[PDB]
Amino acid sequence: CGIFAYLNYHVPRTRREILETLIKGLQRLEYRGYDSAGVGFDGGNDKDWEANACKIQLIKKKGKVKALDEEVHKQQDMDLDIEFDVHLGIAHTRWATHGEPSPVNSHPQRSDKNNEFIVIHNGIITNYKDLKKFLESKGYDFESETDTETIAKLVKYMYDNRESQDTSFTTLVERVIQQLEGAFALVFKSVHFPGQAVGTRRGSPLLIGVRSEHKLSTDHIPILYTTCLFPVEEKAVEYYFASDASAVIEHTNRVIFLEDDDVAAVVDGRLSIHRAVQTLQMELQQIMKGNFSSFMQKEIFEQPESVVNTMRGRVNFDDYTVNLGGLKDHIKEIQRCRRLILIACGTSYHAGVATRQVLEELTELPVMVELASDFLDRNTPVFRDDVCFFLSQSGETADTLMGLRYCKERGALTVGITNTVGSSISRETDCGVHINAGPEIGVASTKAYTSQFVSLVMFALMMCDDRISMQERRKEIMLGLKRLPDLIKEVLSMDDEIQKLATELYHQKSVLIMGRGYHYATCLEGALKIKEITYMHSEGILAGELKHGPLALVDKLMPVIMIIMRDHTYAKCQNALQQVVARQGRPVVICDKEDTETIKNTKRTIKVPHSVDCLQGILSVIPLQLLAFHLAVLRGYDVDFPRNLAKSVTVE
Amino acid sequence: CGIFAYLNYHVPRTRREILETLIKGLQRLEYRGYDSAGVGFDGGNDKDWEANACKIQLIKKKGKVKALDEEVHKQQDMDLDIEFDVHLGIAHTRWATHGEPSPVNSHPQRSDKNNEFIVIHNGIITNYKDLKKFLESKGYDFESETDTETIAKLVKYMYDNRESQDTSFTTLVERVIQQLEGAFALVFKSVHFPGQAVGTRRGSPLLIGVRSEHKLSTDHIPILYRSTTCLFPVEEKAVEYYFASDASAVIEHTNRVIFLEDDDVAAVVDGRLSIHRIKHPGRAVQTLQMELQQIMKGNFSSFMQKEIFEQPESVVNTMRGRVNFDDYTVNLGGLKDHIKEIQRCRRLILIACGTSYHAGVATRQVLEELTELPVMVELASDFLDRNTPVFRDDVCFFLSQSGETADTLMGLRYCKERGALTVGITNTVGSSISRETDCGVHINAGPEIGVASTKAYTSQFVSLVMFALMMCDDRISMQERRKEIMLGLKRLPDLIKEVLSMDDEIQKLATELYHQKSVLIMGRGYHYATCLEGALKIKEITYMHSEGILAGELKHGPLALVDKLMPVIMIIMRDHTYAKCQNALQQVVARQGRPVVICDKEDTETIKNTKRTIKVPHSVDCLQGILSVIPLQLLAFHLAVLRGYDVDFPRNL
Ligand SMILES: CC(=O)N[C@H]1[C@@H](OP(=O)(O)OP(=O)(O)OC[C@H]2O[C@@H](n3ccc(=O)[nH]c3=O)[C@H](O)[C@@H]2O)O[C@H](CO)[C@@H](O)[C@@H]1O
Ligand SMILES: CC(=O)N[C@H]1[C@@H](OP(=O)(O)OP(=O)(O)OC[C@H]2O[C@@H](n3ccc(=O)[nH]c3=O)[C@H](O)[C@@H]2O)O[C@H](CO)[C@@H](O)[C@@H]1O
Ligand SMILES: O=C[C@H](O)[C@@H](O)[C@H](O)[C@H](O)COP(=O)(O)O
Ligand SMILES: O=C[C@H](O)[C@@H](O)[C@H](O)[C@H](O)COP(=O)(O)O
C-alpha cells in the first residue's frame, strides 16, 4: 500500500505532466503493493484551468502500475493538453490482502457519484462496520467492500452537516479521524476545496515533500491547536505527499515527516500542521537497479558493499575494536540483564536463528528466538530484566511492532535492529542499531538478512569485550569479518555454476534443504526464498531430525540440498548425508572448497570458501539466494514482484 | 535387534516346548523390523538330558521368524520329545549392520565349528576391526562379516587362556566387555557351563524375567563386586528365567522383571541369579503393569489403526488415579517428592525429538499460562549443537515414548551435568531416560507398536497439561481456569469418540488428496503443533510432501505457494485466535486457494463458506489440539492404505 500525490501551485503543468508524475510516484512505491492502482485528478476540458477544479476523474484498474499507466493513456475524453497553474492529483497502489483487486476496491475511493470527496488510505479502520451502518441510515449508498469507503462517505457527512458555510477542510478531516479507529494515512481531495490537500496520519507513515526555487519561510512548522511553510516573495511551490521517501527523493530532498494526529493542510499553497522540514540522507542512486535486470539481483550482488556499510565506523581491525554508537548509553545495562529475546517475522526471524548460537557463546545468557505472531498468541512471559531485540528491515511490521509495545509494557529493555531510520520500531525502542544496508526494494530480503546477521555478531563482540578468555575468539571472528566482503565476491563469482544447477531443478515440484547448527537458519531462509519467488515447494529440514520421520520422504526422485561445512557438526552432517544416500537420494551439497572428501563422493557440489564457523552462514545462504533467483527466471517469474504478497507487512 | 532367552531350571520341558517358547518370544520382537533370525539350544537325541549338554545346536536363517519355525520342524534327525530338567535356549532377530542378510551372518554367532560358545547381540562393536585382527593373529578363523562374531571368538580366547580350571563364566564375560567398544546387549551360552546364562549390556536395554511357584529369596538383588546375595526359589529349585531386550517377549510368562544397567553382568549359576560389577546398591525385582493384550492388533488390521482408535482408552489410562473431577485435584505420583522444588525453579525447558517435540509445542502456551514461568521448547539435536546455557534453577523436561532416543538422552545428561532438575515424560518403564531422570511421569499409554507416534503424542499432551494443573493448584485466581480444563479432560474421551465417528468424512478427504503430491497445513496458536504433527505424520506414513505453516507467517513469504492447484488444510477453532485464522483464510481464498478447513462443530459461519470442512466438537482451548490432530492421524492412515502402503512397515531406519 503506497500513497503519492502531486500538488503544483502556480507551476504550470499540463495534464500529461501531472499524470506522468502520479504514475512515476507509484512506481517508486510499487514494491509496497502491486495488486491494483488508481489516480484521482481534475476533469473537464476547459482552457481556463479555473473552470475545471469542480470535476473529479478517477482512473483505477486491476494489475500493477503498468496496467494503470496504460489505462490512463489512450483515453478519448481526457485531453492531455490543458495547462493547469494550480492542481492536485492523488494516486495509490494497493496490496489486496482480502477480496478481489477490482477497480471498485482500489483507491482513491469516493463519497458520491459526483466525486465530491476522494481519499487514498493506507491501513485498516477497525470500526468501518459501525461507520457503514451509521452512514447507510443517513442516506449514503455504498458500492465497494473496502474500509476506505467509510472514510469518503464520512467526510461528506461532516460537510453536509457543517455549522458555518466556510468550514475549513481541516475541520472536516479532524471530525472524521475522531470517528475512525485503527491506523490510517489519508490524503483527501474535494471539489469544494479546489487545490487544497489534507494529510493526516495515525500509526502509518506520511511525509510531505516540498520543492521551490524560492526561499522558504521557515524550517520548523509550528503545530497548532509566521506560521505556514511557503515560498517567500513568490508563489511557485510543488508539494509531494507520499508514504515513503523513495517517491520524493527523485524530485526533492526536503520533506516534513508528520507524526500521529498531525493534520497537515496545503491551503493557497501554504503548508500548515494542525492538531521540522529536514533533509533526506538518501541518494537517488540507492533506489536504482543500475546495470542489473532486477532490484533483487543488484541487492544480492551488492552484499559485499552493504556488509561493509554495516561495519563502517563500528569495526576497527587495526586494534580489533567494536563500537556500536546506538548502544553506547545502554551496553552496560544490557549486561546486567539475565535473558535475550529475539522477536521478528520471516527472514528477519531467520537472522535471529542464524546468530542464536554465537550470542549464547559470547554473552553466556539464554537466548530465545520467537516468531512475532506466535509470541503474541501465547502471551509469552516477559520480565523487567529481559533484553528484547526486534529485527525489522522496514521497522513497520505489525506483529513485530506489537511485540515491542508488549515488552515495553512489561518493563523490558527493548533494542531495535532496523534498516529504516524514523520507523516505528526504531523510534519506540529504547536503543538499537541501524544496519545501514541501504534501501531494499526487492520484496524478498537479501542484503537485509546478511546485514542483520553482521549487526547481531558485532553486538555479541561488544558483550564479551571484557573477557580475557574470549579475546582470542573475538580476534578470530573479527578477522573473519575483515575477509568476509571478498569471500562474498568469491561466492558471487559462482553465479554461472548456480544457474546451471537451477536448470536441473526448475521443473521439480519440491526440494528439501537440510542443515544443522549454524546452518539451520540457512536452510530455513533458503527454503523461504525458493517459496517466495519461484513458487516451488521448498522446505527446510533440521538435519538431526531426518531420522525421526521426514527421511521417509526421500528417494531417487526427491530433490535434496544439503549444507555440510567445516565446523563441529561436520561428522553429524556426513552421517545425515549417508542417510539421504541410503534412501537413494542424489543431493546437491553446499560444502567447503577444501572439503575434498565431500567433493569426491558427490557429483553436484557448490564449493564456498571457508570462514569462521559463526560467519559461514552468510556465505552458505548466498548460493540459495542466487538459486531462487535463477529458478524464478527459468519458470518465467518476476523476482521483484512475487505473487500473493508484497514487501513489509504493516497490517495484521 | 531382538534378544530372547529361556532358561528352565528344574522345570521339565520338552525340546518342542523349549523351541516353541523361543519362537513365540521372537514374534513379540518382530515389530522392530528385522531381516534374519536364529536359535540356539542343546542338541543330541539321547534319552535323558545332561549327556546332551555338550552338543550346542544352531538353527539360523534369513527371512521371517515364520520361516525359522518352519525350518525348526524340518529337522529329521532332531527328536523333539526329549525332556530337559535344566536347559537354556537363546534366540535372536537381526537388523543387518556389519554384513549382509545371510545364514552365516545370522545369530547366534559361534566361537568355533563345535559351538563351545554362542552369543546373541543387539548393537555395534565399534572397535571390532582391531579385535578381529587380534584374534586372527592368535589363530582364530572367522566365517562371517559380523562384528558380533568377534564377541564369540573373544570369549573363547579368554577361556583358552584362563588361569585356573574353574574360572567363572562371569569372569570370562567381564574380560570380554573390557575389550569391547560401543553398544551391546549380550546373552552367552557355553557347553563348558551347562545350564548357565550370562547377560550383560552397555548402551542397549536388557532385562530378565523370573517365574516360580515358590517363594523367591528377595525382591532386591544386591550387586557383587570384585546365600543372601542372589535370587532363587527358597525351599525348592524350580524356577524359570527370561532374558529379553524388550518386555513384550516376557509379559505373557511373567510380570516380575529385573532391569539391567550399563556394565552389569547377570549370571544364572545352579539356578540362582546374581549380578556382578567391577566398580549397598542393588537391582530391584519390580512388577510391570503391561499385559499381552496391549501388544496385539486384536480385530484391527494394523497397529496404527488400533492405536489411533483406542485413544479414548489410552487418554483415560493416562489420567487414571491422577485426576479427581469432584474436588478438582491433580496428583501425579511420580512428582510427589519433587513438585515443591520444581515450583522454586525459574524456567522450564522441554527437550525432545520429532513428535515428542511437537507435544511440547502443543502445551507450551498452557504451561506458560499456569506456571507463569518462561518455557523453552528445544529440539534435542540442536540443543546439543549450540551448547545451550543451562543453570541450576532450570527444570528440564525430556519427552520420549521409548526413553532411549540418543539425542534426548544425551541432552538429559547434558543438563544433569549442569545441576538442573531433570523430569522425564516417558512411556517405557526401565528406559534410560526414565531411570536417569530425577523424577518424571509414566504417561501410561500402553506400549506403542505402530511405526508412528499416535497415542503417545496425545498421552504426552494430557500428561503435560496435568503437570500444568499441579503447578497452579495454590492460586485462587486460577481455580476457575483449572476447573474448565479439568471438565474438558472429563469430556475428552467422549469427544475423541465423536471425532473418530467422522472417519468416513476423512476417507472422502483421503480420496481428494490421493493423487496429490503436496499439501499445506496452516494453523496458529494452540494449533501450530497440530499443523507440524499432521505434516510429519503425512510425510512419515504417506510419503507425500506435507508441510506445516504457521498461519501468521503467510504474508511474510509462504503465501506465494497458494493457487488453484495447491491442496491446503486450515485449522480454525473458536479460541482467541479465531479472527486471525479467519484473516488467514481470506488471504488464501483471495489467491485462488480452496482449502479444507478443520473447524468446530458449531462454526456455522465457516462451514457455509467452505466446501469441505471437518467439524470436530468444541473443547477448552488448551485441549482442542488433541481433537484437531486426530483427523490428520486418520488422513495419513487412509492415504497410505489407498496407495498400497503397509502402515506397520517402517520405510526409514
Ligand atoms: C541516525 C543517525 O544519525 N546515525 C548516526 C550515528 O550512527 P550510530 O551507529 O552511532 O547510531 P544508529 O544510527 O545505529 O542509531 C541512532 C540512534 O537511534 C537509536 N536507534 C537506532 C535503531 C533502532 O532500531 N532503535 C533505536 O533506538 C540508536 O540507539 C541511536 O541512539 O553516528 C554516526 C557517526 O559515528 C553517524 O554516521 C550516523 O549518521
Ligand atoms: C513404574 C511404577 O511402578 N509405577 C507405579 C506408580 O505409578 P506413579 O503414577 O505413582 O509414578 P510413575 O509410574 O509415573 O513413576 C514411577 C517412578 O519413576 C519415576 N520416573 C518415571 C518416569 C520418568 O520419565 N522419569 C522418572 O524418574 C517417578 O518419579 C516415580 O518415582 O504407582 C502406581 C500406584 O499408584 C502404580 O500403578 C505404578 O505401577
Ligand atoms: O523474503 C521474505 C521477506 O524478507 C519477509 O520474510 C520479511 O522479512 C518479513 O515479511 C518482514 O520483515 P521486516 O520487518 O524485516 O521487513
Ligand atoms: O511419528 C513420529 C515418530 O514416532 C518420531 O518422530 C518420534 O516422535 C521420536 O522421534 C522418537 O523418540 P521418542 O521415542 O523419544 O519419542
Ligand SMILES: N[C@@H](CCC(=O)O)C(=O)O
Ligand atoms: N551388529 C550386529 C547385530 C545388529 C543388531 O541386530 O542389533 C550385526 O550386524 O550382525
Ligand SMILES: [Mg+2]
Ligand atoms: Mg529509539
Ligand SMILES: [Mg+2]
Ligand atoms: Mg528415575
